[PDB]
Design a protein around this ligand. Structure first.
Ligand code: HEC
Length: 125
């Protein structure tokens, strides 16, 4: 869907940005600093879940640029793995949310977060 590499870059960064917001916004709740409303959380996770599938398609060959390390392309299999483990954690998050269990959510939240970090460690400049 992209004409220039710059456009894929702009797209993926935007998706990542949005996702960061949707995920990050739950930290105070998960930490107990904000009240917990199951329904609100559930809806937010639904959005997050949609957003989380988006970025991956904008890292095709020829989209080199931004803060993407070249290893994303040299080591595609490793990148796919990182991405899949991440989506899997999203699924867990989603299940915790659906169930309305703060403990579960809290734990899953940590798992997801570690997933973000794992990817960044190997593939983000
Ligand atoms: C690999 C599969 C990743 C996972 C999982 C997550 N992120 Fe990441 N992120 C990744 C890369 C390769 C990049 C650089 C993209 C580029 O082309 O510049 C990023 C970047 C971000 C950003 C910056 C967006 C911007 O404004 O430029 C943010 C805010 C970000 N990542 C956050 C983020 C969060 C919160 C994640 C988990 C919920 C997460 N990322 C996972 C690679 C990967």
């Amino acid at each position: 869907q992209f004409a220039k590499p710059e456009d894929a870059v702009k797209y993926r960064q935007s998706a990542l940005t949005l996702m960061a917001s949707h995920f990050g916004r739950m930290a105070p709740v998960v930490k107990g600093q904000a009240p917990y409303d199951a329904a609100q959380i559930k809806a937010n996770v639904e959005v997050l879940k949609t957003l989380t599938a988006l970025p991956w398609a904008a890292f095709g060959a020829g989209t080199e640029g931004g803060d993407a390390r070249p290893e994303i392309w040299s080591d595609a299999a490793g990148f796919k793995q990182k991405q899949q483990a991440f989506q899997d954690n999203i699924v867990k998050l989603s299940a915790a949310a659906d169930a309305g269990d703060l403990d579960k959510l809290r734990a899953a939240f940590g798992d997801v977060g570690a997933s973000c970090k794992a990817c960044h460690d190997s593939y983000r400049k």
